[PDB]
Symmetry: D4
Subunit: 163 residues, 8 copies
């Protein structure tokens, strides 16, 4: 069963959040994907967050741009850990998204990743690290994936064009 | 009856939001004041915003600091106009509050005022201007209040210490 | 009659402010549109703001970029509520516009929306919400428009390409 | 046994990180606390991160200020999930700390919380939420703690001085 | 006669603008000082700027804080050169003041000085440099003042406590 | 004779500073144009600033990007008034240029205009306003130019496409 | 032998760091180039920095983008002077890179250059200046290179198109 | 003889730059200290930088606040390596100082350290690292100083109050 949900405020956010989904495809981690807006579908948000525990989610990754309320509002309504991905916004280049996600007051946390597609990939990796604490197989695939990333850099030390 | 509600994410916000209440005392505008947190009391927020129309509110002023979700979440759940006051936060000096309130995406507006006590006073004045469109008496008191503010500056053109 | 005016500092601002006009076309709200510059036509600004009440305006939406003086100067000269739209500027990406509109001192408010076309659309929606407090028909169309926006997201929960 | 470590770049950071420790005292979660500097004790950092899995840690909370390398360098060396707390710095008010923690590139995540003591408390709460996925007792205490926080706001709706 | 006017949006700005007045006292340059608010006394602003030429002003120094409209609105209404002093604001530390003064669009300039009391002193010095182009005596006093400032640094090269 | 010099740190700055030159062509104001770098030609800078008075300059406009030292270093070496134009830089979008020009300490002023081509045009207009205080003909052309700009906006109040 | 190493967090950084290499080609300074990631190859970083002294390096230039840990982590592990080049990042335009490199706490320095390709070129020039203190030939080539840069500006004072 | 000079734009900067001097006292490195202002003593700056090589300096540390021109102007006039310390300014908290020092264009480098007293200490340490490349004794004292700093953290792993 899917132990992680990837949600996002808008279809346009998929350009960014697809990179979280890609990590899970690589690591063979079942996941659910859904557009849930704090602003445009507030009642669905509430029912989504209320049922997350009972639906079997152990991590929720939420992405949004601009005044990014989605991740914090999910976190207000569930004990399932929430990771937040700030989507790059046009004018403020995701600074608004970042401040509106990370600056949660005491009592209702959201673990925040980097602005944009690097943070989407990292949210899925952090979610996978969380899951891997109690899933030996996934822990192994993660270790393999990390080693592969390190080996790629190690076997290519010179960035210049071939001799 | 009270046609405006002043709400805020925390009791600590009252140091700032009191300045909105002061404007209404001056203009004799009945108002309701309440601590409503998007993060700490999400279900109350929803019921507050859902009932605002039926409770007779025509403007809601919402103040919050940090990742300020309160004003936008109220606006998502009611057609009653929402004005947002960014409370000055410790580290980011209300920049986080300002970006998290003003940068609402298309579809769910929050009219935002200045960071801190000047924005609290201005939110109440803008709310009073909105009400005064259909309240001749209040329009008159506003006009009187404005004239008094202008006259104060006009009768004191020299800022230096007396001769 | 038109109960809202949309004004802007320059013709170039129309690329942004057109999105406010679009909302009003959708909601069938009569509106006036005009280029009024605080800097290039200061005397027209003064006469525009002075006559707004007598011309029947109940909300003014003002857009400008850079050192954005237009919305605040209108507000200084009329009791008609002013909503400000920060236009995205080249170098500072509308941060200058946002600070120059939102940071009004105590006494002369401007309700500020998001930088750029999302704030233009939201200003018109907030203006329509203000008008809808005393216009049952408009209140209904707004409710319909909101429901349509929510339904669009609800009927499209999966952002991925079709099976 | 302690399933969470709280580490920080300097003794001076304890003024902030104590607030993470406080959450764990409240929730009765055993924890380890240590000063580990990426810059001043790089070899200890490496051995700390290398042994974290074998020492039984399931979450690491790392706090640092300025050019905050500690959390990301821990994360580079272990699969144990890392939460980062940006400590408020003098000149840049923790903006440097926040950017240096949150903006990790793809491959090595750090879940980041708010600048300063609110983020320290939230990191411990997020760590506790992570642990509570497989610890029914802790899940219960968390639920109790949340309810207590909500009830406090609910039973005190009026922020004004007593009648 | 006074060839320079020092104006400011509020009496509170005098704490800053006094430093412009001090330069003129030192250089024996007659000057006029007045509180003129774009926001609170818009009609006085217009009449002030309209009459400046006829009143004999050759430079106007305008100081304001927050959404600082005063200098740009003066400049819109007169050909007399306007220098703008951004007053340090509470939350944004004069960044708002600076952006709202300096970012004037093409056609209506305001020469902007540093945030706060250093910019007030510099505005008066720049105004004096402008006047000194056609006033040999003032040019001489300026030269004397500059030499005195240079000599002070030159005769005190070691910043350490006396032997 | 030329009473204004337009100088700039690099040939690449001409893309921006050309807009100052354009104003002077329009107003028929003789001007000198030169590349002078504080960093790459420090001795020329010194001799340029030292001789400016004797060469007949009454205003100097200096443009530079990045760590923009040119305007302030000219001002340190001459009593001729200096206006500074921050050129838009790649990474920081002229914010670096703006802070490095405007934030001069007490004693050595530089009147600063907007980032980029609007500030270049405005520097020339402010320089022309300075010159026009003692040049009736130029004062007249300026007045004509301003009226033309105002008339353009006035005769085009509707920004929408023709009926 | 090579007395300078140019290292960078990723192959993608070569687009920027190539400009450091170009300076060394011009000045005929032997150099080593390598991709070394603090995050993706932490153990290689440690062995690289540990052996730098013994490998004959007298300056290390390190470039990285985003949460840029590379330069500071090298500096933590060697006494060889480290110069840091902030690579321009997508969302934050190298501001993150700059803060994460320059804001090192007391005890472990990194001399930081400008964001992007200008800082890469300058790091190599500063490294060459450091080496030239004890290398008369290199000192001479540097002097020649500087003179050539100054002469280029001097022989091209007019930036306008040929007569 | 003194192989390093510590210079600063003003006596007030000594509060910060004293921390560079302290490092040199600890490491027994002879040094020269002087107030040299780019703005207030431009001719002294030029003669200082011109003679630095002949006076035996191998590193110059320059501190300044605000529009910080000193370090870059020294670097324009000498091949002796220049390290820049941004002094914390009142309004902009040393951000202006940092941008005006670090953002040097290609050709004239300044190695920049952290804002404020930590950067002053680090500039002296980086200068000492540069000198230590050819001074075995100083290299040894540096190594000793580093080890002492590491040992301090290592022997104090628990930041909490004694049992
Ligand atoms: N922040 C947010 C929420 N929310 O926080 O609930 N819902 C949509 N949004 C944001 O609106 C931004 C623009 O959405 P759209 O107008 O392109 O549909 C998206 O980045 C989306 O995440
Ligand atoms: N933003 C917010 C919300 N909310 O947006 O729903 N609830 C509380 N807060 C903010 O937490 C900040 C600190 O609250 P407290 O920890 O002092 O109770 C306050 O400014 C409050 O507005
Ligand atoms: N801010 C402003 C005012 N005003 O505040 O009165 N008038 C024009 N402007 C701004 O100049 C900016 C550029 O105008 P333009 O040079 O393209 O005509 C526009 O965004 C316009 O809103
Ligand atoms: N960032 C950092 C690291 N590190 O990232 O490894 N070690 C110490 N620091 C920071 O130096 C800052 C000042 O430390 P100190 O000079 O007061 O000991 C602290 O906030 C500490 O976290
Ligand atoms: N900006 C401005 C204008 N104006 O631009 O016309 N009038 C007052 N202000 C500003 O309100 C700020 C606070 O004023 P006050 O509320 O202390 O009277 C002052 O810095 C003043 O300059
Ligand atoms: N700031 C500056 C100085 N100076 O302040 O003396 N000289 C060149 N510069 C700047 O280098 C920037 C890039 O110059 P270049 O590398 O394209 O020649 C230009 O914007 C120029 O103004
Ligand atoms: N900062 C950093 C480190 N490090 O600090 O050790 N390693 C890679 N990076 C950065 O990841 C950024 C993107 O890398 P990549 O995802 O394109 O490979 C690069 O700018 C690189 O310098
Ligand atoms: N930046 C600068 C220069 N300069 O760059 O040549 N000279 C003085 N300053 C700065 O003026 C600031 C205030 O100086 P003062 O008005 O307190 O004497 C100081 O930080 C000093 O470094």
């Amino acid at each position: 069963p899917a132990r992680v949900a990837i949600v996002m405020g808008s279809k346009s956010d998929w350009a960014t959040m697809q990179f979280a989904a890609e990590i899970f495809e690589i690591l063979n981690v079942p996941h659910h994907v859904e557009v849930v807006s704090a602003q445009r579908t507030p009642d669905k948000l509430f029912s989504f967050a209320e049922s997350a525990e009972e639906n079997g989610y152990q991590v929720i990754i939420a992405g949004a741009g601009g005044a990014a309320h989605l991740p914090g509002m999910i976190a207000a309504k569930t004990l399932v850990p929430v990771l937040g991905v700030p989507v790059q916004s046009a004018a403020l280049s995701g600074v608004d998204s970042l401040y509106s996600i990370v600056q949660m007051p005491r009592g209702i946390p959201v673990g925040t990743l980097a602005i944009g597609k690097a943070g989407a990939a990292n949210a899925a990796l952090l979610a996978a690290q969380i899951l891997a604490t109690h899933d030996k197989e996934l822990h192994q695939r993660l270790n393999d994936w990390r080693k592969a990333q390190t080996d790629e850099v190690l076997e290519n030390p010179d960035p210049r064009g071939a001799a």
